[PDB]
Amino acid sequence: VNSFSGYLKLTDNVYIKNADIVEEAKKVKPTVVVNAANVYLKHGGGVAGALNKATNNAMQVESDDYIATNGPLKVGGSCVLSGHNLAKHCLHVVGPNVNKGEDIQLLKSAYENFNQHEVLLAPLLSAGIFGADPIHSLRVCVDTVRTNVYLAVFDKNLYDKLVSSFL
Numbered sequence: 017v018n019s020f021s022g023y024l025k026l027t028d029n030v031y032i033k034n035a036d037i038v039e040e041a042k043k044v045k046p047t048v049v050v051n052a053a054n055v056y057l058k059h060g061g062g063v064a065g066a067l068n069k070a071t072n073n074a075m076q077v078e079s080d081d082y083i084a085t086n087g088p089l090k091v092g093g094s095c096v097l098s099g100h101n102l103a104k105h106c107l108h109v110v111g112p113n114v115n116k117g118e119d120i121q122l123l124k125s126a127y128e129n130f131n132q133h134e135v136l137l138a139p140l141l142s143a144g145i146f147g148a149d150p151i152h153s154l155r156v157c158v159d160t161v162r163t164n165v166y167l168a169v170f171d172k173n174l175y176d177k178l179v180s181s182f183l
């Protein structure tokens with residue numbers, strides 16, 4: 017039993033809700049919140065800009081030190097950093113950005129990072145400003161993640177569409 021509330025169950029291990037991931041993180045304090053990161057951990061907009069803003073820029077300060085030490089992530093890769101005031105940990109995961117021409121097949125590799133964590137609160141990778149089809153992203157999530165994932169979808173309209181079209 018966990019503290020996530022109001023989610024629709026899609027499969028044995030995947031759950032979905034119309035929610036603001038920032039507000040959901042603030043209320044649940046999950047062990048892991050997933051950030052929709054880029055390789056530079058520059059949290060300027062989308063989910064990343066919102067999460068970072070909610071940490072009063074502490075996420076960005078920590079991220080800049082991480083990059084200065086380790087260099088950029090790989091597309092499809094991830095790193096674990098602090099969850100600050102939102103979660104114990106933040107798993108920064110880089111899905112391919114279609115608006116940068118990155119290969120969509122890397123979306124499966126991106127979701128594989130979730131399997132290293134038993135339970136996660138997450139957005140749909142490569143959705144939103146990353147330019148992928150959120151319905152495809154949901155399908156890859158369901159077919160790749162085996163651990164328990166609670167997906168927060170900010171837009172009520174997209175949420176209804178994802179549910180109504182789910183196979």
Ligand SMILES: O[C@H]1CCCC[C@H]1Nc1ncnc2[nH]ccc12
Pocket residue numbers: 035036037038062063066139140142143144145168169170171
């Ligand atoms: O609405 C879409 C657009 C981008 C792809 C995923 C969704 N973004 C979010 N999802 C969950 N919480 C969020 N807080 C701010 C944005 C956000």
